[PDB]
Amino acid sequence: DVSFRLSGADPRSYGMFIKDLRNALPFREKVYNIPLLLPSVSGAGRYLLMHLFNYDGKTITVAVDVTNVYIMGYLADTTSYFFNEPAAELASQYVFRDARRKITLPYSGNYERLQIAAGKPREKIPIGLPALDSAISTLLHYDSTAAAGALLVLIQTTAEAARFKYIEQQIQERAYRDEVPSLATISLENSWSGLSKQIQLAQGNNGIFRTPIVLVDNKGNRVQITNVTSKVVTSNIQLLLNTRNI
Ligand SMILES: *[C@@H]1O[C@H](CO)[C@@H](O)[C@H](O)[C@H]1NC(C)=O
Ligand SMILES: NC(=O)c1cccnc1
């Protein structure tokens, strides 16, 4: 398992937690020195548990699918909560079985459905460590509309930060003051599968993408990624979704 405490948290401790989250995910090979997530994992070993503590020391445990870094659900005291989708249904056969009751959230765990439930797009929701503290606290007591926004914060400050060093850095910059994500952050989140695929297809094509990927950079400009010498590939992306799952 991995753990992170908001009490005493700073950019250093958050960065270390994200390193630990990345390194908790199994892989058997690297592609251009980036861990390639496994095509499949059978049984309980498919799920990583992340123990998150809010500033007051109250805790939730979050179950993450190690093949894609997707959050399946979480445990708050004696109640488990799972997204309304087959992958989370499966997860609930393996994790948090000791919970006294299970609530299936009234949405699946993708951005489209979460944004509808929250009533707002990612672009308008501040993120940062204070927002993560708030998100943990919200998830402690069931409220599905509030939970949708909290889960948008949680996903971006854990899974997306693990996937992209740039997003990790954005959250570090928001350690003590929340701010909506940059355009670049949104573009990277929206392109993780596409980038993962092209980096894998570039092996066998001399590091050249079969199909270029368009992103927004940290200055807000459109850029086209065409090959693995791009900083997006050499320093930014940290985990690759297996093409078997694309
Ligand atoms: C490969 O990517 C690098 C880094 O972004 C870029 O400078 C170079 O022009 C690209 N090569 C092409 C497009 O042939
Ligand atoms: N459910 C998730 O953890 C999730 C959702 C959207 C993108 N990445 C991860």
UniProtKB/Swiss-Prot annotation:
Protein name: Ribosome-inactivating protein momordin I
EC number of the protein: 3.2.2.22
Native species: Momordica charantia (Bitter gourd)
A molecular function GO annotation: toxin activity
UniProt cross-references to Pfam families, sorted A to Z: RIP (PF00161)
Alphabetical list of PANTHER family matching this protein: PTHR33453, RIBOSOME-INACTIVATING PROTEIN
Glycosylation: residue positions: 227
Reactions mediated catalytically: Endohydrolysis of the N-glycosidic bond at one specific adenosine on the 28S rRNA
Family from the record: Belongs to the ribosome-inactivating protein family. Type 1 RIP subfamily.
Keywords: Glycoprotein, Hydrolase, Plant defense, Protein synthesis inhibitor, Signal, Toxin
InterPro entries: Ribosome-inact_prot_sf (IPR036041), Ribosome_inactivat_1/2 (IPR017989), Ribosome_inactivat_prot (IPR001574), Ribosome_inactivat_prot_CS (IPR017988), Ribosome_inactivat_prot_sub1 (IPR016138), Ribosome_inactivat_prot_sub2 (IPR016139)
UniProt key word Lipid metabolism: no
GO biological process entries: defense response; negative regulation of translation
EC class: hydrolase
Active site (UniProt): 160
